[PDB]
Amino acid sequence: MNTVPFTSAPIEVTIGIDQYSFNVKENQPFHGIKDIPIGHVHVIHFQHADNSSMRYGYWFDCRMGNFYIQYDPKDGLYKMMEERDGAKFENIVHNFKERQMMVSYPKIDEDDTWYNLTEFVQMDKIRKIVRKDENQFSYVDSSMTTVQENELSDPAHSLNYTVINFKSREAIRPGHEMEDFLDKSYYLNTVMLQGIFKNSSNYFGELQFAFLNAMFFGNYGSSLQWHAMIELICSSATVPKHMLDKLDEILYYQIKTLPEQYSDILLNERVWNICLYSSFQKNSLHNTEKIMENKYPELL
């Protein structure tokens, strides 16, 4: 079990850690979050009580270093930093625990939610989507735009998701125009899976990461990427059976976890209705279809 200590909490902020969130008051005594489960990526995110705009946060993996949070009064935000002095870090964290100045990551034992949402997400892939190689952790916020979004302006601050475009030369083989547009299997399996992602686990990891950024930061371009990666699978007549089964589990826990009051903006009516009811895979997503119908029958 690992710890992300906080130097202090100068400004009133709602802090999230994965799917949990708590409030800290201005200058409240507070020195971080303990008992964070090893073995998964994690995200620690912030929304200032004075600016409900700009949710922001940091993806990290405690196996990759000792990380702490410190408020910057010049840039006005809670910054993740790495401590290279192992002994100095243990001592800080030991003191703060003894003083009982840390909230505990509140995982229930029966609960596999976070595992299920991050199963294929790997910190090394996040850092290729979010390029800032001097840090072991990755910053994301509500306003960051995607590479594809940019093509339609600052590159250093972009989400480098794999560009999917169903009306592109990459997606359409010359001479197979109609075939490839109505059956995206060759774009999915040859171009994306074999070509770019190398395997389905990396594909699913980008899909899961896009959803999580959409959910936690309201990052619109991530939402577009998540829907696009769902639609590419659903619009393919030929998909490995192991992928369909795993997609159904992936989407089930995403739909399960989505805040009810955000379904209107986070869920694209057209994509979901097409995927669950018109696409080749309309009958391959039984758990996802069952939860969507019982929880958001309005959308459909």
Binding site: K167, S168, E177, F181
Partner: protein
């Protein structure tokens, strides 16, 4: 963006453009089978591809053999249309290729867009106009060449005949659309109006009779009258 009553005059500027109408590509007769079931029998069709500035009608005949052994023919027809339009553009010299293609039905947009990926600077556009190009098969010479075809075939016509020697392309397009609107709303009457007079001839390479200017005014008036009457009948107004 979409083409409508407001940017109507863009059709007659000097940016090359083409209209594509696919309404006569896949044509069937519906009949009963011996067992009392219903079946279709395809007949030859055509893509109607028109430069509204010159009157150029690239008429691509779609022979029934193209449907042999294929499923979902109404859907295939849209892709076949897009394939043939793309092939036409590729065959044209660069300086004759359109800068825009306007499709008369929105369902042609994705098929043409996909077939034209090699021409990213050709805009594919829909229209809000209710253009009557489906009535093209009411023009006898066009119907005749489509039905007689025994193989795929592209046939050329000037759908304006020689009109542009005396009138503008705006006026020529308005006359053509009036003629086709009439033939669409009441083909028999429309045709009676155009051929009533045995003394007015149709040139070998022309589709329409050789009316003087004054005779065109009488004709156009009579076509207008036809269209409005039929409309009163339609809606009981």
């Amino acid at each position: 963006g979409a083409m409508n009553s407001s940017n109507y005059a863009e059709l007659f500027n000097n940016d090359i453009k083409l209209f594509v109408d696919d309404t006569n590509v896949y044509r069937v007769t519906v009949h009963k089978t011996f067992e009392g079931n219903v079946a279709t029998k395809a007949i030859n069709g055509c893509i109607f591809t028109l430069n509204p500035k010159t009157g150029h009608l690239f008429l691509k005949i779609i022979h029934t053999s193209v449907w042999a052994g294929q499923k979902r023919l109404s859907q295939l027809a849209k892709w076949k249309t897009a394939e043939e339009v793309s092939a036409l553009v590729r065959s044209l010299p660069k300086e004759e290729q359109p800068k825009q293609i306007i499709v008369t039905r929105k369902a042609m947009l994705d098929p043409l867009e996909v077939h034209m990926l090699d021409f990213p600077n050709i805009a594919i556009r829909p229209t809000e106009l209710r253009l009557p190009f489906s009535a093209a098969m009411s023009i006898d010479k066009l119907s005749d060449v489509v039905m007689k075809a025994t193989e795929p075939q592209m046939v050329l016509f000037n759908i304006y005949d020689d009109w542009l020697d005396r009138i503008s392309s705006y006026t020529a397009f308005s006359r053509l659309t009036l003629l086709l609107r009439a033939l669409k709303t009441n083909e028999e009457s429309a045709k009676m109006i155009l051929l009533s007079d045995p003394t007015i001839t149709i040139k070998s390479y022309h589709l329409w009779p050789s009316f003087t200017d004054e005779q065109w005014i009488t004709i156009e008036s009579q076509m207008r009258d036809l269209i409005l009457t039929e409309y009163g009948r339609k809606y009981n107004v």
